[PDB]
């Protein structure tokens, strides 16, 4: 299984991703459809041999609160020596449910410096819905992970170039930049702090978001328009310019269309 090999990243980074995906796949095994991506979407590369990638999408079934779950690793050798590695898993719920989504993402281009994003993005306006802030974020101590990771001297806040991106993450989101010195210290951070944190945030999404009133009429619609506004804008700003470049045009066309199709975006 080429996806699950995570071939360009460190053993701990790999292990974190394998464990996260198995847990999701095993735990949602009754609700997930078999993955459906054509062989040339599950894996692809830039024809010139300098970018390669892998995608794993499982849609939820008809009575399931899951829309889909997606994992990916991207490797892209930058011409200016440095080499970018992205690994991410994201869980998306549908409007039969108001609960938060899941995101974890590790982005790296230095050997001892790495961006972590780990969150449970909200699907309701948190200022209109203090009750929602309370059940999903306060009563949850989701914040203790952010603060704890922050206590490390190698860890600083990461703030997205995109205003849209800052605004779509929850108030407890861990958006962190790690770096120091030896890469052995990085590995120790990954292994001793980032994995436990990621695994636990996944447990809360699985136990508290997925497993669950019953969502009425006008609330169901609000969720659809908000969710589809998010995906639509999130794709255009990150996919359409990055993939064309990284991968070249014909392959970007194929994958973006499949990603768009998985996401529900026209």
Residues at the interface with Na ion (CB under 5 A): 155
Number of H helices, E strands in the chain: 9, 8
**Residue from 36, 61, 164, 241 in contact with a copy of itself (CB under 8 A):** 164
Within 10 A of 125 (CB to CB), how many other CB atoms are there?
11
- 11 near a copy of itself, rule: CB under 8 A: no
- Is 132 assigned a ligand-binding role in the annotation? no
- The number of residues that bind a copy of itself (CB under 8 A) is 24
Q: What's the chain's Rg over C-alpha atoms?
A: 18
C-alpha closest to that of 83 among 43, 52, 48: 52
- Is 96 assigned a ligand-binding role in the annotation? no
Q: What region, left, alpha or beta, does residue 54 occupy, with left being phi > 0 and alpha being psi -120 to 50 degrees? A: beta
HSE at residue 14, side-chain half, CA atoms within 13 A, is 10
* Least distance CB 194 / a copy of itself (angstroms): 20
Name which of a copy of itself, Na ion, none residue 266 binds, using a CB cut-off of 5 to 8 Å depending on partner kind: none
* Least distance CB 228 / a copy of itself (angstroms): 10
Distance (Å, whole) CA 75 – CA 63? 36
- 127 near a copy of itself, rule: CB under 8 A: yes
Query: 20 or 197: whose CB is closer to Na ion?
Result: 197
Q: Give the range of 9-17, 73-81, 108-116, 221-229 binding a copy of itself by CB under 8 A.
A: 221-229
Name which of Na ion, a copy of itself, none residue 77 binds, using a CB cut-off of 5 to 8 Å depending on partner kind: none
Name which of Na ion, a copy of itself, none residue 157 binds, using a CB cut-off of 5 to 8 Å depending on partner kind: a copy of itself
C-alpha closest to that of 220 among 55, 41, 121, 96: 96
Q: Give the range of 15-23, 67-75, 119-127, 242-250 binding a copy of itself by CB under 8 A.
A: 119-127
User: Taking CB under 8 A as the criterion, which residues in 133-162 touch a copy of itself?
Assistant: 133, 137-138, 143, 157
Q: At what angle do helices 143-151 and 195-205 cross, to 10 degrees?
A: 170
**Residue from 211, 225, 245, 257 in contact with a copy of itself (CB under 8 A):** 225
Tokens found for residue 32? 């997930």
φ, ψ of residue 55 to 5 degrees: the values are -135, 140
User: Taking CB under 8 A as the criterion, which residues in 50-89 touch a copy of itself?
Assistant: none
**Residue from 233, 239, 244, 264 in contact with a copy of itself (CB under 8 A):** 233
Query: 122 or 193: whose CB is closer to a copy of itself?
Result: 122
Name which of Na ion, a copy of itself, none residue 155 binds, using a CB cut-off of 5 to 8 Å depending on partner kind: Na ion
SS3 191: helix
* Least distance CB 157 / Na ion (angstroms): 8
The answer to whether residues 264 and 68 touch, using CB atoms and an 8 Å cutoff, is no
DSSP string, 21-51: HHHHHHHTTTTBPPP---HHHHEEE-TTSSE
């Amino acid at each position: 299984r080429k996806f699950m090999e995570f071939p360009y990243v460190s053993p701990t980074r790999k292990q974190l991703m394998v464990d996260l995906m198995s847990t999701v796949e095993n735990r949602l095994q009754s609700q997930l459809l078999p993955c459906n991506l054509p062989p040339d979407v599950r894996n692809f590369n830039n024809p010139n041999g300098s970018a390669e990638a892998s995608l794993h999408i499982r849609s939820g079934d008809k009575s399931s609160p899951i829309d889909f779950v997606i994992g990916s690793w991207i490797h892209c050798k930058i011409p200016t020596g440095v080499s970018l590695n992205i690994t991410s898993i994201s869980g998306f719920l549908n409007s039969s449910t108001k609960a938060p989504n899941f995101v974890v993402e590790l982005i790296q281009s230095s050997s001892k410096s790495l961006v972590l994003i780990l969150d449970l993005p909200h699907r309701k306006d948190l200022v209109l819905n203090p009750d929602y802030l309370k059940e999903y974020y306060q009563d949850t101590a989701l914040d203790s992970h952010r603060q704890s990771l922050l206590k490390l001297p190698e860890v600083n806040p990461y703030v997205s170039p995109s205003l849209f991106v800052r605004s779509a993450f929850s108030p407890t989101a861990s958006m962190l930049k790690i770096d120091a010195e030896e890469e052995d210290k990085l590995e120790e951070i990954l292994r001793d702090h980032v994995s436990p944190a990621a695994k636990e945030v996944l447990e809360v999404w699985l136990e508290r978001c997925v497993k669950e009133i019953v969502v009425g009429e006008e609330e169901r619609m609000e969720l659809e328009r908000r969710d589809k506004s998010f995906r639509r804008k999130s794709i255009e700003d990150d996919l359409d310019l990055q993939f064309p470049r990284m991968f070249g045009e014909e392959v970007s066309s194929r994958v973006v269309h499949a990603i768009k199709e998985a996401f529900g975006v026209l």
